[PDB]
Each structure stands twice: as C-alpha cells, then as structure tokens.
Design a protein around this ligand. Sequence first.
Ligand SMILES: Cc1cc2nc3c(=O)[nH]c(=O)nc-3n(C[C@H](O)[C@H](O)[C@H](O)COP(=O)(O)OP(=O)(O)OC[C@H]3O[C@@H](n4cnc5c(N)ncnc54)[C@H](O)[C@@H]3O)c2cc1C
Ligand SMILES: Cc1cc2nc3c(=O)[nH]c(=O)nc-3n(C[C@H](O)[C@H](O)[C@H](O)COP(=O)(O)OP(=O)(O)OC[C@H]3O[C@@H](n4cnc5c(N)ncnc54)[C@H](O)[C@@H]3O)c2cc1C
Lengths: 491, 481
Amino acid sequence: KKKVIIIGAGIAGLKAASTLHQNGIQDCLVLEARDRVGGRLQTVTGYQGRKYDIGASWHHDTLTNPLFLEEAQLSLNDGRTRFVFDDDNFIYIDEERGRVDHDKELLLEIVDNEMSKFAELEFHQHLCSFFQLVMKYLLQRRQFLTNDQIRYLPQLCRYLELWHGLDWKLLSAKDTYFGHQGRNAFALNYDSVVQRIAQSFPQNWLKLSCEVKSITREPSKNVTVNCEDGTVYNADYVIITVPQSVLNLSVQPEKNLRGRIEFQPPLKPVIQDAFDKIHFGALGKVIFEFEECCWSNESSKIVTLANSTNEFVEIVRNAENLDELDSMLERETSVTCWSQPLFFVNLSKSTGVASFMMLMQAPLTNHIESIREDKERLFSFFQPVLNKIMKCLDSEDVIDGMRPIENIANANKPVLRNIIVSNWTRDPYSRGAYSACFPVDMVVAMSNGQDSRIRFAGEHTIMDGAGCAYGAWESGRREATRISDLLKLEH
Amino acid sequence: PAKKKVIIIGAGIAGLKAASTLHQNGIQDCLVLEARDRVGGRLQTVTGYQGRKYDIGASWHHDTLTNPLFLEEAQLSLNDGRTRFVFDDDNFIYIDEERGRVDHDKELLLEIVDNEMSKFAELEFDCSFFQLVMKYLLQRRQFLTNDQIRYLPQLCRYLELWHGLDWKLLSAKDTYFGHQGRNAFALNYDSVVQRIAQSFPQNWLKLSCEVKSITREPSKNVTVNCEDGTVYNADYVIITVPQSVLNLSVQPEKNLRGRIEFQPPLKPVIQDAFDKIHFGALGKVIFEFEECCWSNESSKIVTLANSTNEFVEIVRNAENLDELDSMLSVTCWSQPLFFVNLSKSTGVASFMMLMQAPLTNHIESIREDKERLFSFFQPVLNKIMKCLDSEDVIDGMRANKPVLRNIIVSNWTRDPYSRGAYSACFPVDMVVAMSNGQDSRIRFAGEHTIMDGAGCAYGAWESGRREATRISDLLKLEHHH
Ligand SMILES: Cc1cc2nc3c(=O)[nH]c(=O)nc-3n(C[C@H](O)[C@H](O)[C@H](O)COP(=O)(O)OP(=O)(O)OC[C@H]3O[C@@H](n4cnc5c(N)ncnc54)[C@H](O)[C@@H]3O)c2cc1C
Ligand SMILES: Cc1cc2nc3c(=O)[nH]c(=O)nc-3n(C[C@H](O)[C@H](O)[C@H](O)COP(=O)(O)OP(=O)(O)OC[C@H]3O[C@@H](n4cnc5c(N)ncnc54)[C@H](O)[C@@H]3O)c2cc1C
C-alpha cells in the first residue's frame, strides 16, 4: 500500500521523508513511538520561557557539515539568526587553586597539546583506557614536567570525558583523541531545524504514538510493520532509524522490552556481531537558570577540574614502572561534584541568557538523571562547584530561589530560579549509551542493510559524522536517495 | 697520499655524528676534513655583551617526543643533573603596532580561528601560503568578524619564521605541519657539538682544509684533495656540505668558495634534484640589554605586520578569487617578527629575534652598521617594551628604562660555507637522490639528505649515523671466513 515506511521521526527519519517527498515519491509513512518528532533533538522550555536544546546543541565540523552549511545558506538569504559561533578560550577551575587556565607557570594547555600528540603517535598504524594512556604519558615525560603539571594536567585533559560522555577509566584510549573539522556553532534552535525538515513533507505521512513492535519480510517481497496499538502496515521499502541501543534489544528474547522490534527473519549475524561493541557512555545535561547575570562574561566555556593531590605527584615521581604506578595508586569516599570534571556553558556571553548549560558523563549522568525530580538534592550536589565558578567570575555564592522570596538584598547576587535535567538514560526510546560526534563494523553492517528492502539510517549508520546530528541527517538522505532512484528506474 | 678507511667532508653535526658512529663501531684510520677553523657548521654559539652566549644557528631541540638526539641529551641530564636545555614553549603574546596586544582576546579569538585555518589547510591538501589564506577568508567570510578578517592573516604569518620565507613565496602545501611534542631550547648547542666531537679520536679532525675535489679511482678508491695541496685516498667518503654548497658542483666556475669538483661528475638524478628545493633563509638578531625591566609574562612574542580596514572591505566585496587578487619601502612592520624573551626562559636580559627572507638577506647585508640596525628595529622594540609595561629603549651601545648594549646578527646568507638556503625543520627528490648516493663509495649526509627530521639538527645527526652504519655494515664483511 505504501512505497516506503520510515520508522522513527528523529532527524534521520525526518530527512529521509523530506528527501523522498523532494524526489516525488508518494504514499510513504513515518512511524514514531513518541508523541513528538525530533528524537534526540529536543528543545525544552524553562524559567520565563527560556528555551534549551536538552539533546543536541551544537553544529560540529562547520567546515564540512552539510546540515550546517544548509542552515548557513538560509541565514545568508534571509539574515535571520540560526546559530552562533561560541568557541572560546576555556576557563579551568580547581576547587583549591581557582583558575589554572592560560597560566604563565602551569602552561597546562601546552602540555595537553603534547598529550594529544603522544596519543596520536601511540596508536599510529595500530590495528588500554584513556586513564592508562595518561598515566603512560606522565611516566614517560615526568623528567620534562613540573610538579604542578603532573598534578593538574591529568585532570584538565579529562575534559574529553564530556566529549565522549564517559569516565576516563572506562573510555578506550584509541578512540579518545580526534580532531574536529573547524569551529562549532551553537544551534539557536535545533527545534527550528527539526520543524523545517518535518514540514518539508506531507503531514498525513506522520503517525505519532506508533511503537513499532515487529517488521517482517513477506514471501511476496513485501515488508509488514505492526505498531503496539494494533495497527498494521506494509510497503515496498522500510528505513529503520531507531537508536542503536533500541535496535540492540532485537537480539534479546521477549518482545516485552519497550521499543524492541521483532525481526522476522532475525537480523543476520553480521548485524548481531556488531553490537558486541559500543554502548557505554551517556552524556547528560543540567540547566541552571538564574534571575540575571551578575558574573563575568569573559568566556562562554568553563570546566571545573576534579580534585587532585600532591601525593599523586610524589607517586608519579617515585614509580619505577607502570605496574608499580598502578599498585601505588591505591589509597583509601562518596561521589561529589568535585569527583569528576564538569563542563559549563556560560550562555550569558554567547546568547545573552542568564543560564548555565552543564554537561556530565557516565557514571554520574545516570545517577543525576535518577534524581532529576529532587531539585533540592540537585542544588545541594552542585552548589559547591556553582559557588566556585561564581567566585572565579567576580561574583558570589549562589542564592537558592527555586522557591522564590522577593528580597532586594539579592540585587547583585546570583539567584538560582530553576534546574532542568536531561532524562536520556531513563528514556526507553533512547536508553542505551552515547557516543561522541566524530568527523566501523556497525557502520558497515548498517549501511549494508538487512536486505534490499530493509534499510537502516541514524547516527550509528554512517562514517562521516558518526554520532553526530549531521551524520544522522546525511544517513537519512542517503537511504531515501537510494530508494527514490530505484523507484524511478522501475519505470 | 695518506690512506684512510673513511673520509668525512664537513664537521657539522652530520659529519661529527658520522665520525662518532664509525669509532663506536670500531672503524679505525678515518678523517674529518672541515673548511672552517671550527667544528659545528650551522650549530654555532657566539659570545656577546658581558660574556653572554647565544646560538646564532640552531637553538631548539624540536619534536622532543621522538627526537633521538634530544633523548640522548635528556638521558645525560637525568644521570648527572646538569642542565642542558629548557622547555620554553609559552603562550604567545601577539602585538599590533596600533591596537597593541591581540592575543587571547575574548573578542578577537584569533588563536581559535587560526586553528580553523590550520584545519582548513589540512583538509585542503599547489599554491602559496598567502593564496591559501586568501582562499580561507573568502570561503569563511560569513563566519568571520571584520577584525578577525583584518588580523588573522597577519597572525597566521608567524609560520614565516618557521620556514624563514615570506608567505607569497612559501609553498602552501608545505606550510602547515605539526611537531611531535614540545620544543626544548638548547642551553648551548655547542655543548652538544663538543660532546660528539670528543667521542672519536682527536687526531681525526683536520680544520682549515677546504676540499676542492673528489675523484673515484679505477682501483675503486676515492682521492680527496684539500686546496692547500694535501691529498688523501680512502675506501669511502661521506660528503656533508650543505645542499647550497654542493649545488656549486654542477655550475661552471671552479674558483667558487667551497665548491667540490667531482670526477666523474655528480649523477644526473642528483644534478637534476637541485631544481625543486630551498628558497628561504632564517635569520637571527640578538638584542642585548643591560638588565630586565620589562614583564616576563611570556618568553614568546610576535609582532604582526601592519594591516588595514581596506583589506577587510576587499574581502567582503570580492566576488571570487580572481576578483580578489585584482582588487588587492620596508620597515620593521612590513613583516611579522618573532622575539624570544630570554629573561623568562634563561634569566638573561636579551631578545633573540627570528626573521625571514627577503628581510634576512637585507639585514645580514647591513649587520656591520649597528646604528642603522637600531633605527630599523627601534619601533618594534619600543612597542614591545610598551606592551610589556616598560618604556622606549635607550641606545647604550657606546633606571626603569631598557638600555640596549649590543646587537648581534647572523651571517648565514653571506657565509660561503652555508649560503643561507634554509628550510623548515620537519619531522622528496633530493632526499632520495642523496640517500642513494653518488655510488657505493661516495655517500652523502646532512639535513637535506633525510626524510625524518629534514632541515633539523637531529635529522642531520641521524643522516650521519645512517651513512656511518652502512659503511660499518660493509666493512664487517672483511672479517668473514
Ligand atoms: C545529551 C546529548 C547531547 C548531544 N549533543 C550533540 C551536539 O551538540 N551535536 C551533534 O551533532 N550531536 C549531538 N548529539 C547526538 C545527536 O543528538 C544524534 O546523533 C541525533 O539526534 C541522532 O538522530 P537519529 O535520527 O539517528 O536518532 P533519534 O533522534 O534517536 O531518532 C530515532 C527515533 O526512533 C524512535 N523510536 C525508537 N524506538 C521506536 C520504535 N520501536 N517504534 C517507533 N519509533 C521508535 C525514537 O523515539 C526516535 O524519535 C547529542 C546526543 C545526546 C544524547
Ligand atoms: C638560522 C638557523 C636556525 C636554525 N635553527 C634550528 C633549530 O632551532 N632547530 C633545529 O633542529 N635546526 C635548526 N637549524 C638547522 C640546523 O642548524 C641544521 O639542520 C644542521 O645544523 C645542519 O647540519 P649539517 O651537518 O647537515 O650541515 P652543516 O652544519 O652546515 O655542516 C656542513 C659542514 O661542511 C663544511 N664545508 C662546506 N664546504 C666544505 C668544503 N668544500 N670542504 C670542507 N668542509 C666544507 C661547512 O663549513 C660545515 O661545517 C637552523 C639553521 C639556521 C641556518
């Protein structure tokens, strides 16, 4: 009855639909499990109506990003603002020492650059965790590092944890260091991107609250699709764009799992084997909304470093080898806001909004999202880093005003009015893990499809832009174009 | 003629390491012939005001993560606690004559777009560095502010001091590249030279012998003649004279200083390689002051050449590259200049400045006119002192003010034994031709004969080790049964 059935209304599924329509293909459907489109692209509303992209927020690799270039062309043609280049000189804060960035003595950024080079050479032509790689660097280069560099550098370099959404002891060293193709551009409305694409094809194509539970290849070469609500569909081709984490459920037994799709026949071994990798990270976000800005806007990029110790330095100095270094690194807790690095975006400088957008990594992410409803507890957890940031930004301790009390004595003090938290690790339609946005087994299997009728798209199905919004976007255009060409050739 | 096992021509670091390696491998009766009355070649440490020392040739150990020469020096320091170098990389201070400092500027963010420029170059790869920058500007104009477009190109040119060549003459394809780790400022490259020179029989060195001819004999030996008439015969010869001096061999005129007459002549593959390589010239000027009375915030300072708001206008209006090029007296502000503030890194009240061609050739030609040198650089020197919370410089070459006591200038473009061809230190035709040699007996070493570390002191060092080892491997066969 239908030419193509797209499962998932994320950017991958939406672009696919936009492409099909663009190429004159009719009678298509987009089945989405949620009651909204966008998927991992979701803009939420907070205090005084302020908006924030709780999912994707930046356009990466702007020198080659096709989606960004499309957005840029639009703004060049209508002068409307669709993004802002917010890269900045990072401000690094240690709880005890305060700012350690661009330090005339520490020169941490310079040694971090050496660390990245060290990583590049370590895996050159290679066919270890991030933590171990850093320890290797310190042992090898200690003769050329001051005491404070050995102490702070490892905590600074961990900003990469926020790129991968994963702790350094769990992140693989080989996939940690990589370069981005140009500046990043903060999207001033990824929802505006979702909207434009979503409205580029006929409305009746969209079917929300349609949780696909099964996909079958009929003997008549037709593909049947059934949603939880009982509805049944069939088409010439199907483009599956559900997240890798959801698709992974298909290999497990019991169709019970929310989101899990029953494949008949099952996904071929090439696909199944591909899941034996990835699915560990989890990027989370916490938005702190203040009444107004009363802090320095020197930079829109701030990172708080986890606590470090001088004993750590003594150990690195005394260790005779890696094994002895590990052994010595055994002291004698409870996780606090200073137990890991945290990345804060000072939206005041970049967008003029008196709010901070903070990124966190697994294992913290899961823990914080699990208490996302307990605002008082959230404030207590982050209060110490929030106050240190304010102190370093020429301001003062944050006033908890989530339960407001108009008081003129707060005039020039930061008053927190609301906290917003992501929920991706607890969302059954996203669940699984997170991967950084990069400019192989899974990519090959996915881009290869189940067969000539069952295709796949999404951020986990492409090389260029892997784990990126533009990658998912491009992967959608890819599958749609492949099918439109085929349909056009039929006659 | 005296018989020798191996004769090395040139006592720069390549020749010295070759000799060092030959001795290490037990090879006897060798000789090192050097035209100058000193060893070291392009590694020369001079003395100035109050006995202060400066490397007027190579100064840094580059690519310290893998540099074998540096690693050897580091091991020595680790064992005797003696200081041989200092990691002096720093946050660069950028200065514009009118605007003053423009580094780490919360609004200009020049360092960030410079990084994008670099990535642009990477993804791009042949034209000139200048043209590549112009292309970047046209492609990214929509995402660059007016002041970014004005100053970025001038900041990008710090790379001119890496290659010692103006951006319009510099190959864009060879402009951008990354070093393997931080740099280490040698605290006496002369100490490196002395160590290596003392590592083989002292009777092997013969200074003041300008070699004028090398002849491959039918008996398979090689005859080497010094201009003073002395003759030597050897089984193998390792030639380490600079590429520019070797180039003389293919030109007619035997009276040319340093020129070696080869018989038979250099192979066509070698002769022809002299067509696509070299063009720049890295120069140095040392400014010695009585004492430090300025800010030691950083040891790295770069003065940007003058720019204009008209340039920005042109960039915005240009319809394309063709329309851009159409729409588009030397002073210290006509090109970028790189200054090393030694007070912070070494504690010495002096500035070591690097310059590029064509300026280098002009300045070295007038290095004897100190007053003229002072007047030429006085404006950048003053702007620097101002930005470092100081005052104008007082000429004291003959309290809270900087007093210039002396100026020292390099001489590589005028030195007949170097002839400033200069190339940047990087971690193909000439290399292959050189590494393959003239024949089994006539070999070559030097910074221009190796891929890894090409143009670097450690590259020259390694090339010497390579030729000495090859010869040792061959001589090894003489003891087989
Ligand atoms: C916290 C976070 C921050 C990020 N920040 C950035 C950033 O700054 N820049 C960037 O480029 N990228 C970023 N990303 C990545 C980017 O958001 C994703 O690459 C992109 O949105 C993935 O799009 P997609 O279409 O492949 O998948 P999705 O957007 O996940 O869409 C797939 C759709 O499938 C639906 N679905 C699932 N199961 C079923 C089912 N059984 N039946 C029907 N429908 C189903 C889902 O509900 C969903 O709408 C971020 C990701 C996260 C989690
Ligand atoms: C201004 C400047 C700055 C530099 N800075 C750095 C730096 O910071 N880091 C770095 O790694 N590298 C640097 N270099 C490069 C480095 O100095 C060279 O790579 C290295 O010294 C070259 O060594 P070589 O042995 O190949 O040649 P040379 O050192 O030139 O030695 C060859 C020798 O041959 C002799 N000779 C020539 N003709 C004859 C003849 N006919 N008979 C006998 N002897 C002859 C010469 O007098 C000379 O001593 C710099 C170079 C210059 C010019």
